Amino acid sequence: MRLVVLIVSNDKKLIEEARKMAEKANLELITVPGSPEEAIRLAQEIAEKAPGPVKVLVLITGSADPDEKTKAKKAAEEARKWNVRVRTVTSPDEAKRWIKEFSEE
Numbered sequence: 161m162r163l164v165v166l167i168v169s170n171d172k173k174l175i176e177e178a179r180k181m182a183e184k185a186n187l188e189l190i191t192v193p194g195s196p197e198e199a200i201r202l203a204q205e206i207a208e209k210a211p212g213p214v215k216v217l218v219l220i221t222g223s224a225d226p227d228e229k230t231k232a233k234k235a236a237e238e239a240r241k242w243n244v245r246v247r248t249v250t251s252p253d254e255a256k257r258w259i260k261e262f263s264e265e
Contacts, residue, residue: 161213162210162212163188163262163263164206164207165219166192167192167249168192168193168220168221174221177252181256181260185263187262194221197235200218200244203216204238208242218245219255221255
């Protein structure tokens with residue numbers, strides 16, 4: 161049972177708090193550029209090439225442009241079948257929280 165966390169942002173503190181959670185909770189967290197499609201398409205790969213059942217969490221930071229939101233909408237629709245869930249984060253507190261519940265709780 162491998163859990164994956166894919167974070168869409170380019171921050172210092174946020175990426176810290178996000179990965180610090182993953183490191184201590186043995187979660188596979190990968191930093192994604194601020195584009196939502198990139199993350200989900202990688203999630204599809206990670207889930208695909210994963211031996212056994214996995215759980216993928218994608219965290220989009222901040223506000224999504226119409227295009228980005230449209231991508232994230234269709235991508236999440238598909239990603240649902242890959243056992244992936246996408247959540248929006250604004251502060252590292254939210255990110256840490258979503259990772260906490262997703263971790264083992």
